[PDB]
């Protein structure tokens, strides 16, 4: 058969990933422009939300050195790829778990609906890539919202997960964090309640 050039193989991001990609968390000085966890300035259109979560290993223990990259549509369901700290909204961001509590946070707006390649609407989602020491190739998942039940039930991506019990792992839980609308999204890498991870 036809064989292309092989892809460069992945390796773990390792325990000191933050020195390269999350400078503050390493205990180091930062540069003038950094890619981080506030996707929306206060003036961006849409419902402003806080997202937060913790990451668990197969023994139920916190992964305190996790690094997450996120990619989401704006409130109108359009992806904004022109990354610029001047923008009211960026579709891309990064966050990391703090070493004491293990919690990551993201400040963004709730994404609008985007259609899949066949023209079928997907439920509102945030695309997540998870990196960490011990993770040899990053894990892809999606964060959906528990207040979008009607949309979630019809999502052509959620419906590719064979078991409804497993679909539940991708639904973030609405709450309030010091007065602001928030959603909690825990990831369990392994074992009971294991989060669905995707290949594409």
């Amino acid at each position: 058969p036809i064989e292309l050039l092989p892809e460069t193989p992945s390796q773990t991001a390792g325990p000191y990933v933050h020195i390269g990609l999350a400078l503050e968390a390493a205990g180091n000085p930062t540069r003038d422009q950094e890619i981080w966890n506030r996707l929306a300035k206060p003036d961006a259109p849409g419902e402003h939300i806080l997202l937060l979560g913790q990451v668990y290993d197969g023994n139920g223990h916190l992964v305190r050195d996790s690094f997450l990259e996120v990619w989401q549509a704006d409130a109108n369901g359009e992806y904004q790829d022109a990354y610029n700290l001047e923008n009211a909204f960026n579709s891309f961001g990064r966050t990391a778990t703090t070493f004491d509590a293990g919690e990551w946070t993201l400040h963004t707006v709730k994404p609008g609906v985007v259609n899949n390649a066949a023209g079928v609407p997907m439920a509102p989602h945030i695309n997540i890539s998870l990196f960490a020491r011990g993770i040899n190739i990053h894990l892809h998942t999606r964060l959906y919202f528990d207040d979008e039940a009607q949309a979630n039930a019809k999502c052509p991506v959620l419906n590719l997960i064979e078991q409804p019990q497993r679909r539940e792992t991708l639904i973030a839980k609405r709450c309030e964090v010091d007065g602001k609308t928030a959603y909690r999204f825990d990831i369990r890498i392994q074992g009971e309640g294991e989060t669905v991870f995707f290949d594409f």
């Binding site: 092989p6 422009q33 989602h125 894990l139």
Partner: protein, 236 residues
Amino acid sequence: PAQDNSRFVIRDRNWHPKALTPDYKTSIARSPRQALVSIPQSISETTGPNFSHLGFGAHDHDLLLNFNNGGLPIGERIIVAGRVVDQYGKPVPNTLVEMWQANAGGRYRHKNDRYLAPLDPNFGGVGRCLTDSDGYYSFRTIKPGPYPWRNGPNDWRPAHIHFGISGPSIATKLITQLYFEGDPLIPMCPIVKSIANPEAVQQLIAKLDMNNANPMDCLAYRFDIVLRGQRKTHFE
């Protein structure tokens, strides 16, 4: 206005390291035990950030100057350069390449590194740059030292630089590690050996590049990076 206008060749997950590679001990509890769920590509997966208008400092790619606290870092002065292409051999222009590494003695400038080799007051260990219009990137740095770690009782990472490459979409984003030609630690490392195919490991080994050296100044190493092949949709 990011548009879905391409597809990315499916990853070979037997070329990449598998998740569960028990000689790399931390992988045991941090690897899924359910199969990944395959999904078709949509605009969510086939788009991603472009960093053309991220504001780069003058020395962001030069680790000999970007942590200047009174002088030059101690260690083997090297240029690390290469081309980012996709599997079809097409250059990947204007893409973000980030790197991080220990100093000449194997010490990272990170609060969690308890190895007792000293910090270098003139070395930080982080770089970034954007590939040029022809897919080329270049850094200047010092060659990192190997360092010991709590895996087995006498395990040492080969000298390495961590790399992150964005590429055209979230489907192409990759984190990997560069190793150096000839390093006798490479075949002994359980992280290297998370990659089952020795031909894949060879893709991570930077080659000494005398043609790119600055005489009486610095050596050079070449590290080319291959991202997933990008093609137009057809017959969909």
